[PDB]
Design a protein around this ligand. Sequence first.
Ligand SMILES: CN(C)c1ccc(C(=O)N(CC(=O)NCc2ccccc2)Cc2ccc(C(=O)NO)cc2F)cc1
Ligand SMILES: [K+]
Ligand SMILES: [K+]
Ligand SMILES: [Zn+2]
Length: 357
Amino acid sequence: PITGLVYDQRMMLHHNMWDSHHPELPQRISRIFSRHEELRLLSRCHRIPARLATEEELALCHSSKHISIIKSSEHMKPRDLNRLGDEYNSIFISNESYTCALLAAGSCFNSAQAILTGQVRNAVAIVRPPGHHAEKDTACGFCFFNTAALTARYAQSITRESLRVLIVDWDVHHGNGTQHIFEEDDSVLYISLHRYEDGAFFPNSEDANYDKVGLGKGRGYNVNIPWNGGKMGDPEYMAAFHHLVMPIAREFAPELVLVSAGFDAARGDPLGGFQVTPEGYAHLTHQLMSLAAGRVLIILEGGYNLTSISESMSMCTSMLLGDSPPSLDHLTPLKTSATVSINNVLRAHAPFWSSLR
Ligand SMILES: CN(C)c1ccc(C(=O)N(CC(=O)NCc2ccccc2)Cc2ccc(C(=O)NO)cc2F)cc1
Ligand SMILES: [K+]
Ligand SMILES: [K+]
Ligand SMILES: [Zn+2]
């Protein structure tokens, strides 16, 4: 009954050499880790080592051209790095960026392997740069390689190709990369909750709407829960879980649960605009621990209030360790548009999930 934790301070090497105040700060991961110490959570975990992902492992999800280009940035001069990064949507690059994206992925590989071989029951991965906006053939939105997607495929590579993996993505932004990588796949169920605003919120694509349910045999295995017109928080996220995430997830019966755990929907985030509390994230984590016999891996994605993400992720680890969840009011009413959103998802996915009918 062990909880794993992976953290390597070398992941702070990735930085923005032209804007030292860019919100995707190196100290995002060091503040989360130090808060785990201060709360005496670190010493309760089994320390899992970081490692580099290999190029072969990156090819599980990414094209040879994309891997080659990001790999080449290790040797580039500053103005060439700036030119490269400017070619993407919302990317900065330093000569350490490739190595740090490899360490983020390999840390999660090591955690998933410890879970699937029974060395630990569950794990938390304090990693950067994030992953879920990265596509097979490009970088985007602070993300170089899709860590969560790679971890799902790595997981399958060391157990079965049929290993059922659920990815819950509670970052405030849609994981466009994760959706696309698994869109035609029924072995990996992708569920994303995100601020949508009728397609106006980043990453600015109607791919994130509720009517994108998957393709081919993947039809029904992509669940988008898009929020519109409202500052959402604990009541809305609890209700999405009760009405959508947990019924669908229980019917899918995953064998591994990956959380694309961005904390930019948190109260205090400078750009998410939402108000999920640390208690809220604890409730979500505890809910997910009822799946896959507790085999849950929490992977940091976004989140830009240093104190909010540190408190929020620490509460998640407290849940994985077996601490009792805080009691919340399941009877506070939802903001009006959130009911509309949840109903729109139920209509779209009832054809595929008997648990909704
Ligand atoms: C340097 N500072 C303080 C910034 C602050 C904020 C942004 C920013 O708004 N983004 C999103 C976006 O809409 N951009 C277009 C735009 C154009 C004109 C005006 C405002 C925005 C970048 C971004 C933020 C979060 C994640 C993440 O967390 N994903 O999971 C991924 C991202 F790509 C960018 C920079
Ligand atoms: K999301
Ligand atoms: K899918
Ligand atoms: Zn985000």
